[model samples]
Each structure stands twice: as structure tokens, then as C-alpha cells.
Target chain A: RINTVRGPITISEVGFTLTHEHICGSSAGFLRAWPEFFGSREALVEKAVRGLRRARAAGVRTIVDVSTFDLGRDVRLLAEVSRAADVHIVAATGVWLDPPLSIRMRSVEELTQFFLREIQYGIEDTGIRAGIIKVAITGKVTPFQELVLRAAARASLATGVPVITHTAGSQRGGEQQAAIFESEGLSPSRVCIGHSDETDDLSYLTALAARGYLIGLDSISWQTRALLIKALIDQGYMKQILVSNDWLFGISSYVTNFMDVMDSVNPDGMAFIPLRVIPFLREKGIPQETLAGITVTNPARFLSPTLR
Target chain B: DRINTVRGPITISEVGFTLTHEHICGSSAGFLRAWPEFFGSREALVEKAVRGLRRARAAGVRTIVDVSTFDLGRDVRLLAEVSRAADVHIVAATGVWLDPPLSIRMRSVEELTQFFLREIQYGIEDTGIRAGIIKVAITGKVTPFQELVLRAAARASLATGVPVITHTAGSQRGGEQQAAIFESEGLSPSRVCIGHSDETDDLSYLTALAARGYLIGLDSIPHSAIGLEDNASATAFMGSRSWQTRALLIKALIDQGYMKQILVSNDWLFGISSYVTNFMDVMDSVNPDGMAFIPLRVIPFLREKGIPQETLAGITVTNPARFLSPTL
Candidate 1:
């Protein structure tokens, strides 16, 4: 029921879309390879349905599945959720950070050619498209991330859909990803800095925002630390900010699946940021329109045209 | 000295080092004048004040000037019975409180001066017990009646030489009020203290009061550092160069050579005699039962933050003694 990509494909218009979300399955890496289990599959599906309900309420029209390619993600079930929710679903096609999961254990070019085939025909033949490219570096830069960045850069050049790379709170990982993308001839705007707000320094975020890299202020499941994101955006740089509930299922604190989506999107105990920001600025005599700019309009512009 | 040679049921072995301010007896001013309506009898009050005195002996703080003058049954015989039992030194006062809600009986300036002068002159002159220091109030911001009470206390001080200690407002008025009242009454600044001077955020006000040869009471430092916006501001001010207003004022006094003018004491009495009341709670929900007092809870926090042990003792002991010494 789905087509497969023969090679990397390019498109000038991919439409405005969410470049982060859990699709059908999640990164069930440890669980799938476990000797025994702590969580049941039934619970994971229930969690996924809860997230789907919340996303449907928010009226998100499209989402790109960024589950690590080696992780056991159920792309077919993802398409079903999307179809039921009436959202356009896109799949990812790339190798993940460490050990080779693909059969070839291919070099950068070999993997590039494999990703190109999947992007071109796999989604076309299967009726599910590969919309945005995905890649990641660990806590620090490594040679493999460079190669993956090369493959993502090549895919971006060949496909024209923006590349979303995983950088751990470091815009420098963003920069390295950027250099490779540039070396392969792509714009810095094509890369997104994941987990940018976790670092204690504001300059890390400002650095990415300044270079026009898409700044992700999303994934704030831990609501207290999220004030930094609001604080940064409040400092008049909301234009580069994009929002996402980067949650998915995970049994432990670190795993990601569809359930993590619900956690990130849930607004419980998140009133502190809005309460602290609104009244405090009001006492200091900041305008309401400026507050609205950060909460709504700026976010709208950041994701518009590219995500819509 | 003339009436009954009574100590609190517990005897304070030392008599000369008198705690010029202690709350062995005081009620909330609003509740005090309204006592018969609220609690129906004075029996409940004498029992409560006695309990505070017994606890005072347990803490090794012997001498106390019971400053709650306008409360129920301002009779010396009541305290004299408790003093005979406890054996701790109990100095009773007969001063008039501020004429606002704190004093329902004496709102007129003439009536206040008449009452204050009587207490100072004849051991309550008509009653059995004598008066000690002249007590006045100006909590946070001085009411007009508070200023009037201060004026009366100044006159009483000039007439009797009983020292004057004002419960200053937490605002910026202590310096101006002290100088004006002392000057008008022809009373020396050495007998005057700007109480709760630690609560004022402005350093220059304290220094100016200190410069005028009045003692600055920083007795409140250890209890005031938590989350109160004003108290924290005051503490930050006290840690700066101006906190040495005492030393600087002493140097100026020695220059003018008025060595005996400056003194310090903890303005520690509230409705009850307990060090448990906090700086924040004192500004907020302060009442008689000693709830949420910061010295017990926040002192450990202050210790953890590296506030020196010597500075702590200075506010609690050394500074208070310096002001009380005859040779200052």
C-alpha cells in the first residue's frame, strides 16, 4: 500500500510542518532488546491514543516522524494515526547515531545512496512520504556525526525539504551540522537546534537564533526549566522560535515514544511561566501586545510557510 | 526600689545588668483595651504574663522590664505575686502607649502626658508599683498619635530621667523623630534610643540618628533575613559601611566627647516573650503564640551562609551591653 524511494528526491515546496513528533511506534530500543520487560505494549498504545487526542485538539495539520531509523518505530501504525486524525504524516529515512542497523553497514556515500532510494521511491510507492531529513551528534562532535551530517546535507540538497538534526542543547553541534550542510551546499536555516534551552547560558540559544537557525523551544515536559525558553523568547527573539511537543513513549525517564508527546503537550503545572511573565512585565509596564507577540504571533511566523 | 523587693518567682542572681526591654507582659494593643469585651477577665492575662516570666528564667535572661503598660489590670500587685514566686528580676513600667488603636484609654495628648508623668513620679505615684522606661510606638509608619506619645515620653524623660525607647516605624522616621522630640523636651539624646532601627532600609537615616548621639538598635538582625522585601533590604543596608554608624557615631561623640551618649538593645518584645517570631511573620501574621519565628528556623540558614559567629553575638549581647553601660 506504499511506494518506496529509488533515490533521494528534491522539492521546492514541502509546506509548513512540524519537524518533530513521534509517529506510530517509538524508540523501543532497550525494551525490544531487553531480557525481560517492565512496560507492556498495550500501555504504550493507550499512551499514544492520549497524545493523538491532544494533538487533534491543537489542530496540528502535519508532523514529520523523527524516530531514530534503527529504533523499532511502527511507521504503518503512524500512518493510521495520521489518517484517523486527518494529519499529513511524513516518515524519516536515515541511519541513527551509533552502531550500524542497516544491512550494509555502509559508508557515508553508501548510506547516502540508501537514504536517497528510500526518500525517492519507498514513501512514493508506500503512500507515506519522507518529508524532512533527520541526523544527530552525541554530547560532543564525532567523525560519524560529520558523515551523517554529510548524508543529511546531501539529502537536503537533493530533496529541498529542510533538514532537522539532533544537537544536545549545544548550538555548536548545530554549527557543526551547519558547516557540513554548508560544505555540501545547504543553508543554515535548514537545520534545527534540538534541546537548545537546557543549557544554562542564554548565549547558546542566542547563537543559534542569531545565525537564523530554527530554534526549538519545545520538548518542555519538565515545565519549570521551560521558563528559560520563555525568558529567551521574551527578550525579543521570538522570530526564530518554533514550538513542538517533542514527547513520545518511554518507560524510563529517557526513552521516547508517542506517550512523551502527551507529556510535553500537557499544560498541567505549567502555569508558573505565564503567571510570572505576565504580571511581572505588567508591573514593569510592558505592553500586552508584546506578550501576545511572544505567545502567538511570533510562533506563528516562525513555523509558517515552512510548517503552516 | 521602694515598694516590694520582689523578684519573679525565680531569682535572677544578677540585678545591675538590667534588660532595659523585655516582654514578660504585653498584649496586642487592639486586644488589650478591648480585653473585657474579648476575654471577659484580667485573670487570663496575669496567668499568661507569669508564664512568660518563668520561661525567661529558663533561658538565662534574668532581668525584664515588662513593657506592656496599657494592658488589662495595670496593677503592680499582680506581677508582685508572680515575682515573689519566680525569683527573677521583674521591673514593671507604667508608661502610656501610642494613642491610636493601641491605647483606647488615653488618646488625648494632655491625658497621655498626665498618665506618663504620674507613673514616673510616685511609683505609679498613687498605685503601689513604680515605672521604668518610657515606652512609645511607631510601627512601620508613625501615626499622629504615636508622634504625640513620643513627645509625651520625651517630656517624661526630662522630668524623671527614666530612659526613653521608641518603637520606631519601619519607614524613614526614627532619626527625625528622635532629634525633634529630644531637642524640644531639652532631653539628652543619650537617654533616647530609635528602636527597631534595623528595620529601616535607608542607611543614612540610621547614621544620622547615630550621628545625633542616639543609640541604633540593631537587635533585630538575626531574625529578619528571610523573604521579607523590606527586611531583606534593611539587612543588605546594615551589612554596608553605614552599619558602623554606631562606631562612627561613637567616634563623633568622642570627638564632641560625649562618650556616654550611645547605647544598643534588642527591641525583642512583641505580644509574647518568645524569640521564635520571624522577620517575615512579624511583618505579616504576627500574634502572641510565637509561630513561624525566624530565629529558630532561619538562624541555621544564616549560619550556613557564612555569617560570622562574632557578628551574631554582637547583635545579641555586646552591642546591647555597650548602650546599657554607665561608662559608655
Candidate 2:
């Protein structure tokens, strides 16, 4: 069973999953900045429920809601959406993009315990636990980013939950991220390098994938992802690849201007990979069975605890 | 034989720096015939269409393959006027789009073949503004009618060696299916430009076709807001999906060592003849660059991405010359 927000579900139950998505993107400045701009808590729940329900109808059975605290992740909200939408919402816990001053002040060990506490116990006394370790690497893994990466590493090594990261793919930041995890004695298989599709630098990407690291093509407009995925598949690196949309269901209206246009372009939302991406690739000669490997089995293997 | 443009035939070299898929006029078939004077008398149709093409010529786009199939309102007169006004070579098309007339469907393969052949061999009408290339389309699975049209297009291309440019919905791997039909009729893959190829990210399907020597049109950038303000932004738009697909597809396809077979252009309609004159205000709201999209926006981005000048010259210049040539 996996640690989905609805308590526990079989890893096999994580069918046709979107490994990365956000229900809410909570900036640390959410309150200090403009609370109204970010939709109401109830609205976030409703919109995600609606979006996930549509995804369910479109054949999406699970979603790894890789929303860290920086993204305003709420286990209760995730539970509500999962229950309402009938889709597995895998919650994540760890420091993200810009860890606030309080999180920055903590020692690596303290941060590791915090992630461990959430993964093993629960977030903020709700008996619901997160399923994965979510972290971020800006530029060259900034000192604070290194702090979270190390903690995430420490947590994953402690528990069996996998680590997923937002990388500066252009800078080959995932290389440094892999280096940090390796230093922590973390198996490259235990972590997924997210957004690796941002660059078509095959040498940089294959170097990581050549190692045992999971390369996250985590969907794009998919054409770009297809090029990278196609190249990887050519090199027989399909097993190391994972696919999903880095799309968020609820965010600030200010952010929605660009996002709505995105929705306008590929209105499939969370169902994009299955409804549009997979079928496009399938007809493009990617075997439907092989695509299932990338969408279904690849993510399940990454999320499975046996690797621990 | 030379490439026949609306103005007249030109040597293969004169087909340089081409926009492989474009439209000077494409209305809903009704607007072009319903009231020609609504736009013509106002002269906005010709002038507005000329506006985009004129700027493209200024930006170094030498020839434009206006693949507006007849059923979709391909206006040979407007094309001739735009060619004269913009002073650029424009090659017209003589095929149908997805869901063409049942009248066309009623016709047999030989009949459809003769129709397309006459347009290329004789002329579109009394104008003698003959089409230089054959065009065909498919959005979903190939219906029987669409299949028949494909057969006709293949026969015309086979006899004339004029080359065929197809608008296939990459959503269904239509390009591969289109290729299978044309190849079944014994046409060379190199002579077919699988148009609007940038519509899907299927590098596997695209590379397979290109490897087989079929021309790949990385030209499905019908309308886009990406790659424009990345250099100068209102901050509302950043580097997003659709635009980067065009550039990234080009780079990836080129990296696969098949830049020679790849053609890039914006399959945008100059709104002069369209029901919605998207070229007016909604143009920049969506596409931003219009005919100048490649040279002004995409090319600049490709240059920054460190694509070689020689490579750009080949795609925009030499490669198109070969595709448009009847003797190729």
C-alpha cells in the first residue's frame, strides 16, 4: 500500500498517474501579500475536486500532489479532494522553492526530522501522512536549497518514500542535486529529477539517466516532452523516465492570466497525458503498452517502498 | 520545369527563403463568394493580406506556399494581388481539407485526379495562375472520402513531380497514415511535406517520416503567444508551451541530422478572406508575429539557442527551393 492522502492504497492502485501537480501554490507572502488573489480555501478544494473528477473521467486514477508547504499543501484539503474526486492524491512533505526564515534557521537534522515526522506520523497532528519527499533546487542548489535537499535525502533514506525535486534543468542543476543525494548515501533510484524536459541537452540528461536516477519529463505542452522522451526512448532510457503535467489546479488570479491561456491551449488539465499526450505518442508509433510503462509502472516503481 | 507561382513560373533557385505553409486568403468559402465586394471594394482584403506578406519579404521571406485548399477559400486572385503587392513568389494549392464537399466524395479517383492535375497542368481557372503544389488534409482517422482524395493527390503528384504538401492532424499520427497512402501509390517520400507537423511532439513519428526522406513541416504554429515577449515582455506572457514546441521541434529534428528534410513556417491565415480577420487585432493576441513569426520571433530565439547561421539559411533558403521545384 502507498501513503496516499485517503490513508493507504495499493501501489497498483496508483493507475495512470500524474506524478506532479499542485492544488494550491502558497507563497510565503500569501497572507502578507494578497490573500484575496489566491482563491479561498474552500474554492481551492472545490476547483481541485472538479479538476480531478474530470481527470478521473479521462482515465486518470491517481495524482501525486507534490505540493510542499511552500505550495500551501493541506493534508485535510488533499483528503477532501481525493475523497470527492475518487482519485488518489499523493501528498508530499519537505521544504520547497524558498524556505521561509523559520525553516532556513533549522539544522539539516531538524529539517530531516520535520519531513520524517510528516511522512511517518502526519502533518500538524492530522493522522494523515505525506507519501513523498518534495524539494526544490534553484540555480546550483543554493545553500538553503542544499539544506532542504539534504534533509529530503535524510528523510527518504530513513523512510522509504521517494524524493522528487523541481530542478533548474537548463543549468543542469539536477546533476548537483544527484551529487548531493549521492553524498548523503542516497540511491539514485530513490529520487526523481523533475522538469528535466526544460532542456534538450541530451548529454546532460542522459548522464543523469545513465546513472540510476528517474528523469521526470513531467509533462509540458508534451511536444517538447515528446522530443526529449523520444530521444531517451531511442537510447533505451524509457524505464528511467516518468511523465506528468506540472500544472496546478488552483492559484492566484494574477497567475491565471498565463495559466488560463495554457488551459485554452490544452484544456485537458490533469488528464492531458492520457487524453492528449499518450494518444499522440501512441499513434506516433510509441506502443500504447510502452506508454503505460512510463505513465503507470514507472511512477509506481518510484513510489513503491520496497526499494527502501 | 520551373516552379509555377501565381505571377508565373520561376527557376528552382528563385524559390529561395520560402514560408512552406501560409495563407494570403482563406475564408469560410461563403465570405469569398457571398459578397466579394464587402472586402474587395473596401480593398482591406488585398491591403491587409499584403501587409503581412510585405513585411515578410522585408524580413527576407522570399517565397510563400499558400496552402489554402479550394474548399477552404483559396483565392487565386487575392494570391496574385498579394504576390504583386508584396513582390514575393506565392505558390497556390489544389486539394481539399478534412470534411470536404460530398460532391467531391461523389467523384471517383480518376475524376478527382484529373481535377487536381488540371489545376497544376492547365490553370486554376481562366487566370492561368496555376498551382505549383498539391495539398491534402486529414484531422482524424482517414475517412473513405479523405482516402479517395489522398489517392487523387498522389496520382497528380506522381505524374507531375510537382511535390505534395499535406495538412495532417498529428493528433492521430495522420502524417504516418498520410505517408502510407502516398507510398502505397508509389510516390517518393521526399516529395511530400507533411505540413503542420509541429502540431504534435511525436519526435518518433516525425523522425521516422523524415528518415524515410519525407519532408517535415514544423509549421503548425498557427497562432502562439510564446517566444515573443521573452525578449520584450509585458510579463503576462513568459516562455510557455506552444511557441517553444516550434523552436524545440526544429532544434531536435535538426539535431537528429535531418535539417535538410525539415521545413519551418507559420501556418497562419492572413485574415483578409477569413470570417474572423484574426490578422487585425486578435492576430497579435494569439500569433503576435504573423508572417514575420519565423524571421522576427522564432529565428531570433533559435539564434540565441546557438543554432548555426548556415542551418537557418538552409531551412529558410535552400531547402524550400528544392521542395517547391517541379523538377526536384
Candidate 3:
């Protein structure tokens, strides 16, 4: 069983889970600057609730919200949306790409302790527990990036919650992240190397797959995503793969609104994988069992700590 | 301009429905000396090639690109024998593999290009049988040695104007990276056919390469030898499963307006190795009149799935004709 905002549930019951997604990504600055906007909070919460309900209707039973505190993780609002939409939302506890000076100045052990406390007890004052640890890196890993990645690995070791990461795919950032986790004695089976679909290099992807790491094709275009999924499936790495839209549902102060940016990029949003990629793969006669493995079985396995 | 074959040259129109990648035999002298029943007797080996070729010809095959590289055992004399007996145009390949002799591998790119160019300009080993395609195989990633050979193949292709065909691990999706090197040498994507592309259902990878104006080879089909005991390898299972994906991907590509950029073949080799031996047994075990599965089984399966006859012809015939034309 795993923890969700709706309470604990059996891993088998966690059907069709999205390994990575976001219901809201309001930057801390935006929230701090405008603590009370002109009905923006209610409007954004309603919009996020609608997207979750739509995702649920499209067969998403659970979602792992990857927004860390820096990326505007509001556990209070996340709990409200979970209640309204009636879908299980797994909140994350970690920092985003740009960390605050407070976190940056902390040692790796200090950061790991901080993340461990959040997982062990709860986030802030809310009783909502984080089910996964999220980390991010751009281009190559600087000393600070490596520090955070190692902390994420340490937290995952202390708690069985899996570690997920953001990577600059072309730079082969996933390999670097995996190397850190391996050095920390954390199995690749417990880690997901995200954003791997950005590059068209199958050799790099295959090398990662050989090491037993889950290659996350999140926030990717359908063409590249579909191709990578099919190629990986064809090469017999069916179990070590996950797909999801790193969808941003609510408002963000860092840029324009979520829907506006998603409209220009992936107009279909969360349905891109279910409505588009799945059908494309099916049309190509991909086995129903293999399709189910990536969507249902694989996510269930990732979310269940017992399996790890 | 004429397309060169083991027997000589033929016009583009005469190429007809062709298999872009196939093998006849790679019998070594030592192996033949040891196993007379299997490879020692030339007449029996020629007869086996003749039987497979005749079956293919009857099923509407006119030309076949025999892609057995020199390292894997390319015998111009035996290829000519098969061409004469089978009465099929056999387009031969002149290139090395990852296991080429250190002498060949140590040669400069220009020197390797000259070696491959000589085989194209003059007959290979004085057999008067010129090669029609330049072939190279990359294992996983393009190593320094592999890149050197690929560059030489590209240079030879530029000088000879003959099309370049590649043997890529479909799982590795090395075709695009392979194309980048070849394109760097001034060879257009249209002059290259990326072989064994059927191993992946990644349309983005396939279409991206196809959109670049390169030819995609859906060559391995009816891979029945996979997924039973020790034969249970990823490529084997994928080959078995990929036939369906291959057909579907072909239809999708056609709908996306890439029919002219597709070529299909069996990648089948008779008396080759253990890879196909088990597959052949299963094939014959099912249908007594066992032949190449592409022409026998896969074509019909694709046609039954509503693939247009014209599109099928383009894949099997017209596309390969355009890809193999000596002058692009």
C-alpha cells in the first residue's frame, strides 16, 4: 500500500497512474507578491479541479505532482483539489532547479534530513505526506546540482519513496543522475530518469535502460514520445519505462498561465498520451498487455515501495 | 545510367520488385572443408540459393540486394553462380563490418575509400562482378573504428554514385546518427537506405529520417525464430512482433505521405547461420512450400490489412528501384 491524499490504497488498486504531472505550479514569488488576487485563487483551483476530473474520466486514477516548494507546491490547495476531483494526488517534497539561498547553503546531509522529515511526518502543518522526492538539473551537473541529487538519493534510501528527476536530455543528464544514485547504493530500479525523450539518440537511451533505470518520457512531444516508447518497447525494455505529460494546470508567476503555454506547446495537454500516443501505438499492433504494462503495471510497481 | 549487378548492369525500369536486403550464403572455405554436406559442395549450395531465389522470383521479385559484407563472407564467384542459376539480378555489396581485419581497419579513410571504390570501378577479386551497393554494419554506437568505416563508405558512395545501405541495430536506432556521418560526406539522404528499421515502431524516428529524404528499409519480417527457449532474444521476439508493427507503421507512414521513401525486404539469408536456421524450420513446419516469409506471408498479411496494392508495389518495387539507381 502507498500513501495518497485520499489515504492509503493497495498498489494493485492504483490503476493507470501518471508518474509525473502538476495540478498547479504557482511560483512562490507570485504567491508571496499577490497573497490575495482578484478571485484568482478560486478560479485557478476550479480550473485545476476540472483538469483532474477530466484526467480521471480519461482513466487516470493517481497523479504524482512533481512541484517542489520552490516550484510552488501548495499542499493545502492540492488536498482541496484531490477532495473535489476525487482523484489521488501524490504530493512531492524537494526543491526545483533554482533553490533558495537557505537550501543552497545547507550541506547534503542537512538537505537529506530536511527531505526525510517531510516524508516521515508531513509537509509544513498539513497532515498530507509526500510520496515521492523530486529533483532537477539543467545542462550539466554543477556542485550544487550534484549535492541536491545526492540528497534526493539519501532521502529515498531512508524512506522507500522513489526518486524522480528533471534532466536536460541532450546533455545525457539522466546518466549523470543515475551514476550519483548508483554511487549512493540506491538501485536504478528505485529511480526514474525523466525528460529522456528530448534527444533522438537511442544509443544513450538504450545504455540507461540496460542499467535497469526507468526512462521517463515526460513533458515530451507526441512524435518523439511515441517513437521513444515504441522503440524502447520493441527493444524489450517494456517494464523500465514510464510516460506522462509534465502538465501545468494552474497559474504560474514565472511566466504566463499554464494553459496558455501548454496551448502553444502541447494543445492536447494530459490527453496527449492517452488519446494520441496510446492509440498510435495500438494502431501499430502493440500488444494490449505491453500497453497496460507501461500505463498500469509499471506505475503501480514504481509507486509501491514494497516492490523496490 | 545502369544499375550494376553481379551479372552486369540493368536499366532502372528492369529492376522490378526488389528485396533491398537479403543474403544467399556466407560459406567459408574452412567451414566448407569441414562440413561437406552443409557447405563443401558448390552444386548443393547453388541449388539452395536457386531454390530460395526462384521462390522469390515467382512471387514477383526481380532484383535482390545481397548485403553480406566482406567480413561476413562475400564470395563474388558463388554470388555469380546463384545469379546465373536463379536467373535473378543479384546486386552485391563491397564493405567491411566491425570485425574487419586490423589491416583494413587501420587504413586511412581515403585508403579504405579507394579500396571500396576499386571494387566498384573494377570487378571484385577479378570476378568481373561489380558491386552495386556499399554496406557497413554498426553494432551499438558508432565507435571511432565504425565511424572511420562509415566515412569511407560515404566517400566511396560519393565517388561511385551508388546507393549506400546500412545494417543498424534497430534497437539502437543508429540510422539517424549513421545518416549524419554519410550526409557530412556530401551524400544526399535519398542515396541512403537505412536497413533493419522494422525493429522499431518509433514513427518519429522513422519519419524524421524519412522526412530528411532518406529511404527506410522495413526488411526483417516473419521473424518466427524468436521467443522459444534459447532463441528467445529481444531481436527475435521483436522481429516476430515487429511484422505487425511494421505493417502498421508502413500504413501510417504512407498516410503521412512517405510511401515513396519506403523499401521492404526479408533480410533473409539461406545457409547463413543459426539465426535463421531455427526460423526456417518453424516456417517450413507451418507451410510445406516454405519460401522467404516476406513475399510468401508478410505481403499477403499487409494486403489483407487494406494496404493499397500500389503502395505495396512502391514499397517492394518502385521505391527500391529509385534507391538503387546508379545516378541519383
Candidate 4:
């Protein structure tokens, strides 16, 4: 079963999934301090519904919502949006880049158990189980970030779910994350090193893929993303690739209105993939088969449930 | 001295029946570009704004002080066009919004003061249209950055002899802090307009702000569904008390003989970022009657409460004229 925010569905149903995106990315600190500043729960859900419907219109059937608690993950809100938008949202169980104080103080084992509970039972009494284990590393892994990575690895191993990462690309932290995950007895194939598109280091990307991990070229602009993906395919690394746009929609105090921020920062937003990247790849003579593998097959295989 | 209009400066007497704060078009221009359908096309959005402003004119609104600053799309050129097309005077602001760009934040207070002063003394972006008032915001808790912006506004206000208008997070009693800062900067209490004073039900705070001789802005009049009141989805009458609360508060202040120190307007906007699909649909859901709330609903309600015509005129007209005067 593929665990979605609206409950479990079969693997066949998870179509053309955007592996990383957020409907809401409110900061934990801000939420606690200035709850009134945020749009109401209903308002937020409605906003997400509108964005998701737009995404649905663009042929996006499923979304892997990697919004951590620190990124204002609300399972109930996600569930409502799923129902309203008629799109499957695989909610995440993980911490964001800035771990909360409570999380910082917790041991790896405690954090793993916390994640396991959410995966096994549900998130925050919402009964909507987490479908993946999300983790992030900023510069070099600090002692705190190392603990988070270790905890996420153990939880992924225990839960038999895939592990996705937020990598600091210029620092090549994905390499460090792979080593840690492998050290913890987790297979590299279960990991998808994200934000790898921010760098154009073919040697570094090839070396990382050699270790059996999937390469995430998410958020590389349309032309650059096409170039990089073509290069990987030429090097015979087709299976070890995943594609997505790290689109942030809805409002958050940290970003004010994220849609507005992205409109300035990255105008294409979620539409970049379906509107630009895919058509560009086709025009560039990248095989139709390779395109299907990156967008559909790769994500389906990566997110498929382990044996019950 | 004259009140600066988008076309050019006009005598203070011409700033008649002024709405102290309203926005014709705001939010990121890039956002509008990506999703022009949200705001209608640029032509359509401008058309709607022109239509709204024309309606405001027909309702006897002679002037409008647009408090949209640099952060919110402060299009002086557009305001100029709207003013001419709608035949209403628009007093454009020279300041930044609640959250300014990093470049603006990184500057020194003196630097920001100079920036705003230049906009006032010369004009904004070579539009040859000067700013009429200095506007800024104060949240529940003022950050160092917010404090810096407020101080810069005070400096600009003092330097140019222009009145300062503030956006206060009323529930947090932010207006008090703004008053203290402006007063310390030697700006006369009468020279400042403390805005968003209608959010609170506390008579003491409202009267205290008025007693200090500051022009209290019951600006968010006929409270529309904002942020997210649970009953926001309901029809206009379902969970309606904002208008009643605002009316009672205005009555209390007028009875206490502070009518001259009052300025009333709707902090309405032509475009809200989240209401993207169709602005009119969102407007219908939020507040069906847009800018007409003041002249139609608010004035009629005030008259029913037995607020004398002189007091009503003071709130609507004379008070704004005095506040918008370049030098007091």
C-alpha cells in the first residue's frame, strides 16, 4: 500500500509524483509565537486546494509533501487538501533544516522512535500515516545535524520507507549523508540525495550515483535541468535519477506569502516542470522512454511499500 | 502649503472628504505577472481600479491617501492615471511596508531617512509626483528593524514637515509604542495618524490615543472578514459585529468630544495576493461591497447613532485636510 494523506492506496495510483513540495511552510517558532499572524486553518486549506487543483490540471497526480514540523507540517490540513484537490499527498515524517529545541535535545534513538510511531500509527492523532522519512543537512553536518541524519536513517530502516534528503549542494553534503546512511546499515538505493541540481559537478554526481543512491536534480531551471539529465543519461545513470520542483505554495510568516516570494525568486514555480522542462527535454531529443523513467517509473519504484 | 497629489500638489482645502488609507493596487508586481489572471490582466486590473475609484468619487470621496508603500506595489504612475481617469485626488505615500526588501533593511536609519526625504522633496522614481505622507507599520512586538523604520519615518516627517501615518497591530496595543516614538522625535501628536485603532474594543486605549491629540484611524471600518475569523466563510450577516464594534467605538470617542482628532477610512485593497483565482470572487466571499462601505454603510450608521453632521464631517473631511497639510 502507498500511504497517502487521505489514507493508503495501491502503487499504481501514484502517478507522476512531484517528490518534494510544500503547501505550507510556516516556521515552528513563528507559529508558536505569532499564531494569529497566519491565515486560519480553513483559509490555508482552501489556498492549498486552489494550488493543487492547478497542479492537477498540469497532469500532476501525486505529490510527496516534504514539509517537516519545523516547516509547519499539518497532517490534518494535508488530508483536507487531498480530499478537496483529488490528489494523493504523501505526507512526510521528518525535521526541517532548523531542528527545534525539543528535537535538538532528543537522542537519536528517541527521535527514531518518534518517527517510527508516526509511520506505524499516525501523525498527531490524524490517522494519516507518513509515507517517507525526510531529513536535511545544511553546510557540513553539525553534531546536531549528524544526530538528525542518523535518526532519520534508523527510522527509515525500521519503517521500511524511503529516505529523502535536503542537501547543501555547494558543500556536496549528499556524499556525507550517503556515508552516514551506509554506516547505519541502510542501503544506498533507499536514499534520494536532493538539491544535487544546484551543482554541475558531473564527477561528484556520477560518484554519488555509483553508490546506488538516486540523484535528485530538483529545482534546476528548465534548460539546466534538461542539460544535466541528458548528461546523466549519456553516462548510463538513467535509473539513478529523480526529478521535481521544490515549489512552495500558500502563506508562511517566514516567507510572508510564499507564492509572492517565488513569483519574484522563481517565476515558473510548480509549472516549470510540466510547462517547460518536459517539453524542452522532448525537443532536445532525450528519449520518451528516459523521460517516463525520470518522472514516473523512478518515483514509483522509490516510494513503493516494502513487504508487509 | 499644499497636499501632494499624484498629478501634483493641491491646496489642503482640495483634500476634501478624504479616505485616509486605501490601496488601489499592491503586492509584488512579479506575482501579478506570473498569475495575471488572479488580478485580471494589467489592463483589466487597472480598469477595475478606475471603476472603483470612479464609484468612490460618485459617493463624494474627493481625495484618497494611498498608504501602499515600496514593499506593496507603490505605482505612482498608475495612481496618477487612476486619479485622472476617476477624477479623484490620490495622495501617494513615500515609505516602506511591514516587511521591506533586504537592501532597504540593510541600510542605516540616516540612509533610509535620506531615501524617503528624497522621495518627498523631489519625487518617486522620476515620476515627478511627490509623496503626500510618510507611512510605516508596527506589529504587536516591534523588532529592531521595525523600530529603525519607524525612527526613519519620524526623521523624514520632521525633515519634510509631512505628517506620518502608521499601520499598527492593534490587538497588541502597538499604537502606544508608535505614539511614544513619534512624540520622542518631536513630531507633534496632531501631526501623526495612529492607524488600525478599530481592532481593539478597549475604550481606554482608543480614548488615550485620541486624548494625546493624535488622529485616530478607525480605518478598517465595517470590518470585513480578514486574516481568518472562523465565520469568514459565512454570509455577511452571519458573524457580524466588527461594524457594530467600530460604530460604538466611534460613538464613544465623539461623545467624549474628540471628533476633530478622528480620521475614518477603509483599509481596503484592490488586490489581495491569496485571492488569486478571481479577485471579485474572493471579494464576494470576504466583503461583497468593497470601497463603498465607508460612504454608504459607515456614514449612514454614524448618522443613525445621532453623530452630528459637523462631527461626521470632521471625521470624513476637515480632520484629513489638517493631517495631510504639508506643514502644521
Q: Which candidate's DockQ is highest?
A: 4
lDDT of residue B140 for candidate 4: 80
Per-residue lDDT tens digits of candidate 1, residues A1-308? 11112212222122223446664332322222211222544455454555555554544444556664443344555655555555455667664443322211236875575567556544323435565567756756677677777887676677655566666535456666666676887766666666564556677678767877777655443444455556666666666665455545443323223244544555421222343434554555556765555444443333222421
Q: Give the top-scoring candidate (TM-score).
A: 4
Q: State the C-alpha lDDT per candidate.
A: 0.49, 0.76, 0.74, 0.75
lDDT of model 2 at residue A28?
A: 28
* C-alpha RMSD by candidate, in order: 26.7, 22.9, 26.2, 15.7
- List each candidate's DockQ score: 0.00, 0.01, 0.01, 0.03
lDDT of 4 by residue, A1-308 (tens): 78998888887888888898887665432222223334455566666788788878888899999887556576767888889999899988877664433344457876787678668877754677888888877886777777878988888887778888887525978878888888998888788998888888998999888888888888734587668988888888989998888886654534334457666776556666877788888898988888888888888888885522
User: lDDT per residue, candidate 1, B113-232, as tens digits?
Assistant: 766766656454224455656777665455666667777777776666666666665545655755685688677777776665555556566666667778655433333333335554
Ten-residue stretch with the least lDDT total in model 3 chain B: B27-36
Ranking by TM-score: 4, 3, 2, 1
Candidate 3 lDDT over B81-158, as tens digits, reads 888888899999887754453234445677668768867887675466778999888968788878888899888888
Lowest summed lDDT across 10 adjacent residues in model 4 chain B is found at B28-37
**On residues A249-305, what C-alpha lDDT tens digit does candidate 2 reach at each position?**
655423334556767876878877778777777777888778888989898999887
lDDT string for model 4 (B116-223, tens) is: 886788777556688989888978888788877888988888877898898877557888888887777788888898888887788888888888899888887755
For every model in order, the TM-score on chain A comes to 0.70, 0.93, 0.94, 0.93
In Å, residue A5's CA in model 4 sits off its true spot by 42
The parts of candidate 1 lying over 4 Å away from their true place are A1-18, A24-43, A98-104, A123-125, A169-171, A221-225, A234-236, A250-308, B1-328
Name model 2 segments beyond 4 Å from true.
A1-308, B37-42, B225-240, B272-280
Clash pairs for candidate 3: none
i-RMSD of all predictions: 38.5, 29.1, 32.1, 16.2
- Expressed as tens digits, the lDDT of each residue in B1-328 for candidate 2 is 6889999989877777899898876553322432344344427777777887888888888899988766565768778888998999999988776534333444578767877887888777557777888889887888887888889999998888888888876446888889899989998887899887786788898899999999999885544545355533312222234777667989998899998998998877656433322233544566656888888888878888889999999888888888877753
